[PDB]
Paper text:
An extension of the CDR1 loop is instead present in VRC-[name], another antibody that was partially sensitive to mutations in CD4-BS213. Some of these differences are apparent when comparing VRC01-class antibodies derived from different donors, such as the difference between the heavy-chain CDR1 region of VRC01 and VRC-[name], with the latter possessing a unique insertion that allows recognition of CD4-BS2. We also tried engrafting of the CDR1 loop from VRC-[name], which was shown to be functionally important, onto the potent bNAbs N6 and VRC07-523-LS.
The native [name]-1 envelope ([name]) spike is a heavily glycosylated trimer of gp120–gp41 heterodimers, which mediates viral attachment and entry. As the main antigenic structure presented on the virion surface, [name] is the sole target of [name]-1 neutralizing antibodies. Among the gp120 supersites, the CD4-BS is the most conserved and less protected by the glycan shield, making it a primary antigenic target for vaccine development. By docking and mutagenesis studies, we previously demonstrated that certain antibodies to the CD4 supersite, such as VRC03 and VRC06, establish functionally relevant quaternary interaction with two neighboring gp120 protomers in the [name]-1 [name] trimer, while others appear to make contact with a single gp120 protomer.
Author numbering:
A (entry chain H): 1 to 82, 82A, 82B, 82C, 83 to 100, 100A, 100B, 100C, ...
B (entry chain G): 128 to 135, 151 to 184, 188 to 309, 312 to 321, 321A, 322 to 398, 411 to 458, 465
C (entry chain G): 184, 188 to 223
D (entry chain L): 7 to 67, 67A, 67B, 67C, 68 to 95, 95A, 95B, 95C, ...
Amino acid sequence: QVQLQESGPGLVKPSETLSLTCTVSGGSISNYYWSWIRQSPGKGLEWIGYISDSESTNYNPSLKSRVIISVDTSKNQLSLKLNSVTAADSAIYYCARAQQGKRIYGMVSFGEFFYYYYMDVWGKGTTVTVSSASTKGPSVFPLAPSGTAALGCLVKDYFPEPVTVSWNSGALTSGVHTFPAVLQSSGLYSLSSVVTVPSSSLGTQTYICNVNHKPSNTKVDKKVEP
Amino acid sequence: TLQCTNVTRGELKNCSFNMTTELRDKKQKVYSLFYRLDVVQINKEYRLINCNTSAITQACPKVSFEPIPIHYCAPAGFAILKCKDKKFNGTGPCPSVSTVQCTHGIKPVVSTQLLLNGSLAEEEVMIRSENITNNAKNILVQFNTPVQINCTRPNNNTRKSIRIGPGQAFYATGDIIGDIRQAHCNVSKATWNETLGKVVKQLRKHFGNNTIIRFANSSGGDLEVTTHSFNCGGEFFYCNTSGLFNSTWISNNDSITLPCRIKQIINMWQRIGQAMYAPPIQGVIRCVSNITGLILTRDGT
Amino acid sequence: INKEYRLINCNTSAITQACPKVSFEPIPIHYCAPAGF
Amino acid sequence: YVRPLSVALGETASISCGRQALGSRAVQWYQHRPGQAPILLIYNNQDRPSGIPERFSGTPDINFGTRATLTISGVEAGDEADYYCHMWDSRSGFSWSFGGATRLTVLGQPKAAPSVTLFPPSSEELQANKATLVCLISDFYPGAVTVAWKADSSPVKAGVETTTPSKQSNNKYAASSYLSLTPMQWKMHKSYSCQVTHEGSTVEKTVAPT
Ligand SMILES: *[C@@H]1O[C@H](CO)[C@@H](O[C@@H]2O[C@H](CO)[C@@H](O[C@@H]3O[C@H](CO[C@H]4O[C@H](CO[C@H]5O[C@H](CO)[C@@H](O)[C@H](O)[C@@H]5O[C@H]5O[C@H](CO)[C@@H](O)[C@H](O)[C@@H]5O)[C@@H](O)[C@H](O[C@H]5O[C@H](CO)[C@@H](O)[C@H](O)[C@@H]5O)[C@@H]4O)[C@@H](O)[C@H](O[C@H]4O[C@H](CO)[C@@H](O)[C@H](O)[C@@H]4O[C@H]4O[C@H](CO)[C@@H](O)[C@H](O)[C@@H]4O[C@H]4O[C@H](CO)[C@@H](O)[C@H](O)[C@@H]4O)[C@@H]3O)[C@H](O)[C@H]2NC(C)=O)[C@H](O)[C@H]1NC(C)=O
Ligand SMILES: *[C@@H]1O[C@H](CO)[C@@H](O[C@@H]2O[C@H](CO)[C@@H](O[C@@H]3O[C@H](CO[C@H]4O[C@H](CO)[C@@H](O)[C@H](O)[C@@H]4O)[C@@H](O)[C@H](O[C@H]4O[C@H](CO)[C@@H](O)[C@H](O)[C@@H]4O)[C@@H]3O)[C@H](O)[C@H]2NC(C)=O)[C@H](O)[C@H]1NC(C)=O
Ligand SMILES: *[C@@H]1O[C@H](CO)[C@@H](O[C@@H]2O[C@H](CO)[C@@H](O[C@@H]3O[C@H](CO[C@H]4O[C@H](CO)[C@@H](O)[C@H](O)[C@@H]4O)[C@@H](O)[C@H](O)[C@@H]3O)[C@H](O)[C@H]2NC(C)=O)[C@H](O)[C@H]1NC(C)=O
Ligand SMILES: *[C@@H]1O[C@H](CO)[C@@H](O[C@@H]2O[C@H](CO)[C@@H](O)[C@H](O)[C@H]2NC(C)=O)[C@H](O)[C@H]1NC(C)=O
Ligand SMILES: *[C@@H]1O[C@H](CO)[C@@H](O[C@@H]2O[C@H](CO)[C@@H](O)[C@H](O)[C@H]2NC(C)=O)[C@H](O)[C@H]1NC(C)=O
Ligand SMILES: *[C@@H]1O[C@H](CO)[C@@H](O[C@@H]2O[C@H](CO)[C@@H](O)[C@H](O)[C@H]2NC(C)=O)[C@H](O)[C@H]1NC(C)=O
Ligand SMILES: *[C@@H]1O[C@H](CO)[C@@H](O[C@@H]2O[C@H](CO)[C@@H](O)[C@H](O)[C@H]2NC(C)=O)[C@H](O)[C@H]1NC(C)=O
Ligand SMILES: *[C@@H]1O[C@H](CO)[C@@H](O)[C@H](O)[C@H]1NC(C)=O
Ligand SMILES: *[C@@H]1O[C@H](CO)[C@@H](O)[C@H](O)[C@H]1NC(C)=O
Ligand SMILES: *[C@@H]1O[C@H](CO)[C@@H](O)[C@H](O)[C@H]1NC(C)=O
Ligand SMILES: *[C@@H]1O[C@H](CO)[C@@H](O)[C@H](O)[C@H]1NC(C)=O
Ligand SMILES: *[C@@H]1O[C@H](CO)[C@@H](O)[C@H](O)[C@H]1NC(C)=O
Ligand SMILES: *[C@@H]1O[C@H](CO)[C@@H](O)[C@H](O)[C@H]1NC(C)=O
């Protein structure tokens, strides 16, 4: 059908331009309405703006003075350029297709109707942090095991969120259980993944966790073994 | 002096004023809604339309404006002579005549342009005038088949009593409950087409079989005469009729909709000095009536 | 509502002072029927 | 802000909209679990998209007066999320903000016991002159645990960090716990424990340097 995927810096310094993009898959870009929504921690869902299939700009007056949503039909990709960002602009930015509804209650001839928009399909989300602190890659340290056993990988000090953990480049998927990160008082997150493993296969099968931190362009692997 | 703001185009207003209570030394800041046609300027500062011309009297909210059939009777020793002639025009010698003691049930419908709920003509559609060659004489055309017209104010208005003195309560328009919509009237475009044809036919008998008969809207005047003025369920409508008189006729589902406005400070007849405030009618107003006559005026094709 | 008071009628009806020259005295009245009754 | 609401497992939920309309309305309902993509449940006052259970149902405005309410029958444990009411109506203008989040919490869920797994410091980080214990807790409900570290038998309380209980896919909660140590403090002790008290019971997992 139609699916979207966002992508962006993930980290932008204060007082700067927050660029973002969203590639949609399985449908034409110039025959639907598209809408940007962010969700800050603790705050509610905030509707940024929306662009029509006729490429018309209409933004939330809460922002407006900083938003400029664009769209390139050569691809199935549309952008989002919030500028003069502050600390509060940290949120999970979502990409959702809006559809137009016309609610008629009286006479269409006198204009006794109003337009309502509803978003049906959503992008997965893209975390964006604002901090003057620079990016920093992590460092994976292996957690060796000892019927059933448990082994994992420790992903120490990194910044900012997030990191993606895969086992055997995607082959080992049953029994995996990655845990939420932990923000130390130093200002860096520390994440840990673990895979429950049958005890007989400890000495035979090989286990490698694939850790990736996008804001640092770092792809690192490691091996776990008693 | 009224402090008025628009309501959430710009026709009906929302007006707050300082008003006298039941005690003569106490005020109250009440608010009431008013249609545009009832106020004039000086938050913006407004004022009721009548204040600089006439005193104003609120219609008692228990008397009805409903046309009731009235019969005029002559005293003893007098009589009334009917006219049984099915094609009898204005004047002349009525061939068949009868005598009655009272007239039929005449409904005193106050209307404009379109004669409502009246009595039809048998046989053919008649047309009457003093001198039809005189342009300054209204043509009184009477239909034979009624064309139905449906009118409604769809807003769900509410009435609010305001004690302005001992035993003195002014009924104000509280607020609209739900959608804000336009008042209007529907006529069947087909039935109004065939009725205009019946009229245009008898119009040729006096002006020529080859001359073309054209209908236009009003050319000027006050609201009462430029619009289909009437009363529906207690509220005084004023309907634009340009959608009914916009046809040119040569020698040889459907609905028309009329944008009607609403007023409340009405002078009724032509008296300048006796204005009436019609109190607001609670609920949704809709009425169904026949337009059985017409009042045309040829231009001095 | 010194204590603050108000006449009883004010919130219901206007009020009219009886003219101080008319008397409430019951005077004998006779009802008469017209001629032919 | 957030509105608390509590239903029982398998009952019917009556989520009233935050703002009641003035005219004819077109209300959308959204389901949003924190740190996840919002789910459109109902877009026209009563119309649901493709892939929403019938047990979700919004009220349509056939007659004015009836306020918009989201009905969830047979509430599962997976129905715990925030529910927004996107209200549009003829009288109010363009409704930019979504509703007030109604945070539904299902009562009477199965009470599950935590799974504690303590790992010793790795040889690479020990060779990097830094020690770190990691005490992984998972599959507990209600998601609220307190972690207590002990060196041999003495409490630590110094240099500890604990995740807030985040919710798993299986509707249970999980939280990590990291105790930072120096490579000599971990070698100069006999044992290290991770007391994980859940509800009214504790679970101990000990790890020694050998
Ligand atoms: C005097 O003369 C006057 C003029 O001649 C005359 O004025 C007329 O007044 C009446 C009454 O006041 C007006 O009637 C209203 O009509 C509204 C509009 O209805 C039309 O459009 C809708 C929507 O159409 C879109 O969607 C359908 C699919 O649903 C598509 O098929 C359409 O093509 C269209 O989709 C395209 O277009 C959109 C733009 O509009 C695009 O955005 C979109 O992307 C697409 O490209 C249709 O559903 C209607 O179809 C009905 O009509 C056909 C014949 O045409 C009938 O056979 C059949 O019954 C169809 O149902 C129609 O075409 C109505 O919306 C309105 O009724 C709603 O509003 C009132 C008040 O708000 C509610 O009380 C009422 O209950 C209705 O609410 C329902 O619908 C809304 C919107 O979906 C819901 O949100 C709401 O919750 C509720 O849902 C419930 O009912 C649904 C069914 O209605 C049901 O599906 C739900 O499950 C739920 O139970 C009202 O009736 C009329 O418009 C005036 N005329 C004109 C020309 O303006 C006057 O009456 C005369 N007489 C007097 C004054 O006495
Ligand atoms: C025509 O114009 C008049 C004004 O001249 C309007 O009358 C006012 O209408 C507004 C609403 O549009 C009224 O405001 C509402 O007042 C309610 C009463 O609360 C008061 O009393 C409590 C004590 O119980 C106080 O705590 C409170 O502060 C108020 O003083 C409120 O309940 C309403 O609150 C709503 O809005 C707020 C902020 O927007 C929200 O946070 C709330 O959750 C809630 O949704 C609101 O404030 C005002 O009272 C009216 N004035 C009078 C004198 O009645 C007419 O409505 C208008 N009519 C039309 C048709 O246009
Ligand atoms: C032309 O003539 C028409 C009919 O002769 C007029 O229509 C009449 O309009 C008045 C007011 O607009 C209506 O009176 C209202 O009645 C409703 C309720 O009526 C209903 O309930 C009663 C029960 O008692 C029932 O008997 C009726 O049949 C209705 O079903 C009230 O709520 C109002 O307050 C008000 O009293 C008449 O009912 C209505 N008659 C008909 C037959 O529709 C029309 O107004 C005339 N046009 C003009 C311009 O004068
Ligand atoms: C109600 O709305 C109308 C329509 O916007 C307003 O009309 C405007 O009035 C100003 C004068 O103050 C003019 O300069 C504009 O040109 C008018 N606009 C239009 C479209 O006619 C009206 O002022 C509003 N009334 C109130 C009380 O707010
Ligand atoms: C409007 O239409 C007709 C007038 O032609 C009236 O309905 C007819 O009324 C006569 C006598 O009252 C009856 O004999 C017919 O059976 C009626 N026809 C139908 C179809 O009902 C109607 O009452 C008129 N309304 C008015 C004048 O207010
Ligand atoms: C118009 O509005 C009034 C209220 O302003 C509505 O009256 C209500 O009617 C329901 C029954 O449908 C009663 O339960 C309420 O108690 C009534 N409210 C009041 C204040 O009396 C009326 O239904 C509305 N009508 C339309 C056609 O919209
Ligand atoms: C005016 O209103 C009347 C009644 O409200 C309408 O008459 C109805 O017409 C429909 C369609 O033919 C019938 O199904 C109903 O039975 C009729 N009602 C009655 C009481 O007989 C009429 O169509 C309307 N006309 C216009 C021009 O609006
Ligand atoms: C009512 O009178 C007071 C007296 O100062 C004034 O301030 C206020 O504006 C008046 N209200 C209105 C609606 O005129
Ligand atoms: C009354 O006021 C109106 C304002 O609309 C003005 O045009 C008119 O001349 C005034 N009439 C009289 C008789 O004072
Ligand atoms: C009415 O008819 C008579 C005789 O048919 C005629 O003399 C008279 O002019 C007619 N009235 C009008 C206004 O034409
Ligand atoms: C009559 O029609 C003309 C043109 O259609 C329009 O400009 C004028 O305002 C109309 N008059 C009335 C009273 O509707
Ligand atoms: C009547 O309607 C016509 C068009 O329908 C419009 O041009 C005209 O202005 C209206 N009459 C008045 C008095 O506004
Ligand atoms: C008038 O005031 C009296 C105070 O004694 C009160 O009890 C009564 O309800 C009021 N009546 C009206 C009609 O306002």
